[PDB]
Design a protein around this ligand. Sequence first.
Ligand SMILES: C=C1[C@@H]2CC[C@H]3[C@]4(C)C[C@H](O[C@@H]5O[C@H](CO)[C@@H](OS(=O)(=O)O)[C@H](OS(=O)(=O)O)[C@H]5OC(=O)CC(C)C)CC(C(=O)O)(C(=O)O)[C@H]4CC[C@]3(C2)[C@H]1O
Ligand SMILES: OC[C@H]1O[C@H](O[C@H]2[C@H](O)[C@@H](O)[C@H](OCCCCCC3CCCCC3)O[C@@H]2CO)[C@H](O)[C@@H](O)[C@@H]1O
Length: 279
Amino acid sequence: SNFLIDFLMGGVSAAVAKTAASPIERVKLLIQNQDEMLKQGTLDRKYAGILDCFKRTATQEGVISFWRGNTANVIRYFPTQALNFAFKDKIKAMFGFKKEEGYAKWFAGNLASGGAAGALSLLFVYSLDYARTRLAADSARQFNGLIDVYKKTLKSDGVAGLYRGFLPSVVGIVVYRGLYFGMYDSLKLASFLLGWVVTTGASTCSYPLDTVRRRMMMTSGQAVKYDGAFDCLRKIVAAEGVGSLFKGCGANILRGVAGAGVISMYDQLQMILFGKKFK
Ligand SMILES: C=C1[C@@H]2CC[C@H]3[C@]4(C)C[C@H](O[C@@H]5O[C@H](CO)[C@@H](OS(=O)(=O)O)[C@H](OS(=O)(=O)O)[C@H]5OC(=O)CC(C)C)CC(C(=O)O)(C(=O)O)[C@H]4CC[C@]3(C2)[C@H]1O
Ligand SMILES: OC[C@H]1O[C@H](O[C@H]2[C@H](O)[C@@H](O)[C@H](OCCCCCC3CCCCC3)O[C@@H]2CO)[C@H](O)[C@@H](O)[C@@H]1O
């Protein structure tokens, strides 16, 4: 039952990190998809910034509201790690490389590997991300829970509603991984600084894809939908300008530092309270 303990405790760790990150995560998602909310009459007025969003959301909805949708984040660990344990090792065997065999080969193989594993994961898991996203962007709240989101979205758009924005998310995974490993190699506390700068750059450069993905998610249950990722992109840029793609980026970076800090702290607390850390 050792594997069970490692599994569940790892899930507790991930749950801690995601729960801590949750409040600033929602602010990012609100600022990012506020035009969609305006379209769906879920928002009364465009936000002025991060502080505005925090203040308004708090005073109007409450404090607990900041952890809305986080349950999806918590229960996401188990199917992902089940898939992670099952196939990630075997997939790496198919595409992986030691740097000595070739840097180009290592890079490309790493891209293909991470992309394929990520896609395989999303094939089972993407719906949870959809639910999280739809629950984050609210306020009579449009949705009343995970199950409500699923049932209603299935009732309106069927299965495709749950998997909307899949391709820009995959492309996003590939791009993000490429930037991450590239920057990681280029420049290699010191560890905290490196991790923060790398993560920040990689996530920032790959952000518009994420925005497209999430706003495509938002169109589920609506009469008007984007005709693919490129169509979405084109319409967003035409209507609101290029900067609109980067809406909520800074809040996401704040989620970054927050998450890194919390996960390091909790790792320390794990070494204190338990013999070994479960990550
Ligand atoms: C278009 C985008 C933007 C760029 C790509 C992704 C991630 C950043 C992509 C990121 O993708 C992660 O990248 C990591 C660094 O390479 C990689 O770690 S590593 O392989 O050990 O090196 C993770 O692989 S895993 O096996 O450990 O789990 C991988 O997560 C996945 O592939 C699982 C999928 C279910 C996502 C995961 C994730 C994260 O913020 O971390 C997450 O799902 O939480 C995404 C957020 C959403 C976007 C943002 C997606 O909307
Ligand atoms: O806040 C007002 C508007 O913000 C966004 O529009 C941005 C666009 O997204 C954005 O692409 C556009 O850019 C124009 C400014 C160009 C910046 C020049 C850079 C030079 C280098 C240093 C940084 C700035 O500015 C618009 C504002 O006039 C939103 O997309 C709009 O919906 C919103 O009405």
